[PDB]
Amino acid sequence: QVQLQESGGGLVQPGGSLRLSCAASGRTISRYAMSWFRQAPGKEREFVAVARRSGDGAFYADSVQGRFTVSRDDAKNTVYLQMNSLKPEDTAVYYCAIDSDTFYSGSYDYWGQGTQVTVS
Amino acid sequence: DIQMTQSPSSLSASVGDRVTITCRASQGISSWLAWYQQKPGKAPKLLIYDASNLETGVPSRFSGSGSGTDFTFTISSLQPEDIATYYCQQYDNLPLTFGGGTKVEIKRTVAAPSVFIFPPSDEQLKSGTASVVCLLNNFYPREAKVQWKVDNALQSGNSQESVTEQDSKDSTYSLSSTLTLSKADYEKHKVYACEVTHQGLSSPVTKSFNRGE
Amino acid sequence: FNATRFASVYAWNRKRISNCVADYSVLYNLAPFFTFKCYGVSPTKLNDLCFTNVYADSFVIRGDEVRQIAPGQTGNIADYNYKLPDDFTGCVIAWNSNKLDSKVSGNYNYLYRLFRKSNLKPFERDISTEIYQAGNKPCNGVAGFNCYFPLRSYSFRPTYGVGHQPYRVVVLSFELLHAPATVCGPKKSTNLVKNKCVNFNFNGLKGTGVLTESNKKFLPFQQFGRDIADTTDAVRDPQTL
Amino acid sequence: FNATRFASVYAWNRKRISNCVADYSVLYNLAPFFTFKCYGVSPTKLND
Amino acid sequence: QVQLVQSGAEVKKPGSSVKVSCKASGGTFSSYAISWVRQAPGQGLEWMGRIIPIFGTANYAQKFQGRVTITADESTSTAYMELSSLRSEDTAVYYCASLASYSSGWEDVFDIWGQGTMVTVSSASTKGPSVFPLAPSSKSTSGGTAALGCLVKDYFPEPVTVSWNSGALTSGVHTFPAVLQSSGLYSLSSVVTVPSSSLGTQTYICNVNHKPSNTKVDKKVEPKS
Ligand SMILES: *[C@@H]1O[C@H](CO)[C@@H](O)[C@H](O)[C@H]1NC(C)=O
């Protein structure tokens, strides 16, 4: 098993923008593509976005395509996420996953921890 | 014969969302194209006879447009009856040719499996053969991994696997593996274990049993 | 004209055109419309006339076979699939359609009749395809001399020349009596001068004369008034009535 | 038709015809003939 | 109105010729025509050929000339398709559909379709499945529920029906698609999820039936610890 945790998020006013970040240490970060997930209350896990080594822009799910952005920095073993115009739907709990397979085109995502978002 | 290719092969969207389909041809057909929707293994239902004309009784929800070597097929809203493969039928020439099909499944969100294990029964062992089955139920996305590690050593080439289609009751999936062995092999080994990895497990999950259990 | 679907020369498609403004330049300006032959009317004047009714037919036939599409002609198409009346007025339009209708030993969907129990009446349509009776031998099942099936195909193989290549044909049948009319060209209107000698064109009726407010009680269903010897005595304005 | 002096298609038999009636309603249409066909025009038209 | 009804499933060994037919109803035979298409497992459709019985004209796809012939008659008002020299790959379902390119100038795209006829080619012969229940562990419990199952193996030809409590139980009943062994015999599986309290207190039984042989099998299911 490997460790992975988030930073940022939390309470915000509706209509604003929010930042999120997630990082690891003590292991190779390039071999895995780092992905990000969501869970609504009383409902199961959702896919949101992921960034690859090629840097070919972002990658999204169906709903989050028009309101989200993702980026990474291997030199600091950290990934970044960006949110725009948060809505009442943003009252859920996220997760930070990694495509846990060595340079694999597919993905077997693994996450260590997750944090909440809530519009006041 | 003139071929066609459908791109992309698979789709996932929630009920109510607008969806589009396209297919590709090596030579320019003069709008001699038709579209079908087929439930996997069932009789196809005819949708569009002329490239942009719906068939009798087809709902207005379906439409398409395009010209020359390419065409596009779209739906204003993904509806309950929509988990099916869409084919663009070429009839420009006498030799009929059919596309590879574009499959769409309801976009539901990741769900962890229910991981269960099977030590074999006596009635099977009386036949001189032994088996062990590992089961995953109601998970998402489409696939999950299962591996056998009899005596904690990974094994290959003695198991068979089967997978269900998307479960429209909750848009999840299921998977299981059936290990097969002989009675001599059953006696030789000591511990049987199944290990599982899926989109929704915090870490690999292990299920195992011993000779006395 | 631009519909992808064209019926066989029997059970031929028929479309009624009503309450519209026509523009025939969009037709004869098309490159593929190599053949544009009209009877009772000329290509140049189509946009200037106005028609009481308009009907358009369409079908697919061979190239040289289009020769049979004319008033009072005789032949397989003229007698057993599609016949024009001897006094037909309108235009016959056809063009090459190999790019669409030609297939290697194919194109069965476009058919016709070589023979029929009796010659077709003008504009008569027959959807049935029953077998012609032999007469000399009882025939409910298939049989010899005359119990062969009427329908049969060219196979429209691309190796065919214009003598057998497909031609896509559309025929316009017109009634060219004066109003009431609902289909005709984009000719612009003009103010109505009265009590002065003026050249007038009322819904296609050309003439020279003085226009005066008539005092004869036209019934609401009448649209023209003729004096002796077919002379138009009065006419109602198609705009203010 | 009835001569049958053409048992081999190789070296087939030929004949020329002129100055007669050509009543096809009987010719090629009696019971003995199993098949009969005309190309380019129906037998009914050829009859006259 | 016009409708199509096809023959039943037909099966025989590789290298032989399989017959298939479907009746013509509505209107009559001489105002009718047929074409045949293939639907093999895990792929799309495919077109074999076409017939207009009264024309005598028939066509076949480049993939099926010679290996395929078509015949039909008015006495029985039905079409007769035959395929020869079948491989194991030929296992598929064949549909006959009403032809439209037969008269009055509409196109060749199939509106009326038959029920589908299944043909499976294998060296095996008609025999019933082998069935054995399952014995899930007590650690196999989750959310107050346990999964039980029975397997089906070594049967040929299709179809096979698997039901729980002889069809009396449907809540949580799950089934699996069949697989084909290298020996030419099929297999199947199915499970049902039930509360841990209900099992043992209420009898749960699997049932398997094989229509070709008209045989029935059932057995009980119980976890173990
Ligand atoms: C035609 O249009 C004119 C101008 O708008 C109008 O005065 C007249 O009533 C209209 N007549 C008909 C029959 O529509």
Residue numbers in the entry:
A (entry chain W): 10 to 129
B (entry chain V): 1 to 213
C (entry chain C): 342 to 582
D (entry chain A): 342 to 389
E (entry chain U): 1 to 225
Mind quoting what the paper says about this structure?
pmcThe Omicron variant of SARS-CoV-2, the causative virus of COVID-19, was initially reported from South Africa in November 2021, and quickly became the dominant strain worldwide. Compared to the original wildtype (WT) strain of SARS-CoV-2, Omicron has 60 amino acid mutations, of which 37 mutations are in the spike protein, the target of most COVID-19 vaccines and therapeutic antibodies. 15 mutations are in the RBD, which contains the ACE2 binding site as well as the epitopes for 90% of antibodies induced by infection or vaccination. We report the structures of the Omicron spike trimer on its own or in complex with ACE2 or an anti-Omicron antibody.
